[PDB]
Design a protein around this ligand. Structure first.
Ligand code: BEF
Ligand SMILES: [Mg+2]
Length: 116
């Protein structure tokens, strides 16, 4: 089994992502903000972290930078409603950047790719 930490400030979106990823065969933990995400990730043993960007408190881009710095081989997907940050250099900390879509096929492909 692979374990994924799903980080997003919107509870109904956390819930949706948790359901979608459970269907693909993964075990899912969640965090509601960046600080919680870092606490969970550093103390835990995740295969992949999926990170929203816009959240109250530190942004997902800040979180991605910290994970990359303290876990060199971490697998990180930025999953955000907004394509704005794709050309943001902070986004370079992540392995993949996915804009949220109601069709989850693309996110699932990128997940399967990183968990190879
Ligand atoms: F609030 Be996330 F960047 F869609
Ligand atoms: Mg958000």
């Amino acid at each position: 089994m692979k374990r994924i930490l799903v980080v997003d400030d919107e509870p109904n979106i956390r819930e949706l992502l948790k359901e979608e990823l459970q269907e693909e065969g993964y075990e899912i933990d969640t965090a509601e903000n960046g600080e919680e995400a870092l606490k969970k990730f550093f103390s835990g043993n995740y295969d992949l972290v999926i990170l929203d960007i816009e959240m109250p408190g530190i942004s997902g881009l800040e979180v991605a930078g910290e994970i990359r710095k303290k876990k060199k081989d971490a697998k990180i997907i930025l999953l955000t409603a907004y394509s704005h940050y794709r050309s943001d250099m902070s986004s370079w900390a992540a392995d993949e950047y996915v804009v949220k879509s109601f069709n989850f096929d693309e996110l699932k492909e990128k997940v399967k790719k990183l968990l190879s």
